[PDB]
Design a protein around this ligand. Structure first.
Ligand SMILES: *[C@@H]1O[C@H](CO[C@@H]2O[C@H](CO)[C@@H](O)[C@H](O)[C@@H]2O)[C@@H](O[C@@H]2O[C@H](CO)[C@@H](O)[C@H](O)[C@H]2NC(C)=O)[C@H](O)[C@H]1NC(C)=O
Ligand code: CA
Length: 178
């Protein structure tokens, strides 16, 4: 709601970084990711979850040519799902919702027709030993500029945790709680 923690990222970019305590690093067969955003950027990474060093697994929510999508890897090759029909960089508030079940995924913006992707043949299922949630894209040189609100990832309200000064959150660069 109104109480959902909201952060503004400026033109110079910033990062909010959640690092799981070592023993708390999760492994999942399915994920759920959602965030409210407003932006005019043609390109930027909003959120990326990475596994521990040496493991290639990741899950990345990003905008490319004004269109929002998720690319992820759970141990085979990059799997992508995208809202290709309509751009989201119109400077209006949207909600993007993503689910993953093994190699399968869904993606919806607002109330638009749902995108679904079901890779064929033998697949892996586990997103192994997740180590960090990077928000804002600055670390990968694709900074997000705009507003992020009410980020939800697998039960974690990460922006709420940032706003509450969670000891496993680091914030730097051009980012501000509103
Ligand atoms: C990932 O998704 C596959 C395929 O999903 C099935 O096919 C269509 C996709 O076009 C989808 O709309 C249906 O809902 C259906 O689930 C899953 O594989 C299927 O699993 C179901 C339920 O266990 C079986 O009835 C089907 O035989 C089976 N089909 C195939 C082609 O294998 C798969 O389980 C799923 N992966 C995970 C981890 O959930
Ligand atoms: Ca894996």
């Amino acid at each position: 709601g109104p109480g959902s923690a909201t952060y503004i990222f400026g033109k110079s970019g910033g990062l909010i970084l959640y690092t799981w305590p070592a023993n708390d690093r999760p492994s999942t067969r399915s994920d759920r990711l959602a965030v409210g955003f407003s932006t005019t950027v043609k390109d930027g990474i909003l959120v990326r979850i990475d596994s521990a060093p040496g493991l290639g697994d990741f899950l990345q929510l990003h905008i490319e040519q004004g269109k929002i999508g998720v690319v992820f890897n759970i141990g085979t090759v990059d799997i992508s799902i995208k809202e290709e029909r309509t751009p989201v960089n119109d400077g209006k508030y949207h909600v993007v919702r993503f689910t993953r079940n093994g190699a399968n995924a869904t993606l919806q913006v607002d109330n638009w027709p749902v995108n679904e992707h079901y890779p064929t043949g033998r697949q892996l299922t586990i997103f192994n030993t997740q180590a960090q949630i990077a928000i804002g894209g600055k670390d990968k040189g694709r900074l997000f500029q705009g507003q992020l609100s009410g980020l939800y990832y697998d039960g974690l309200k990460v922006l709420n945790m940032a706003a509450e000064n969670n000891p496993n959150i680091k914030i730097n660069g051009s980012v501000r709680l509103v």
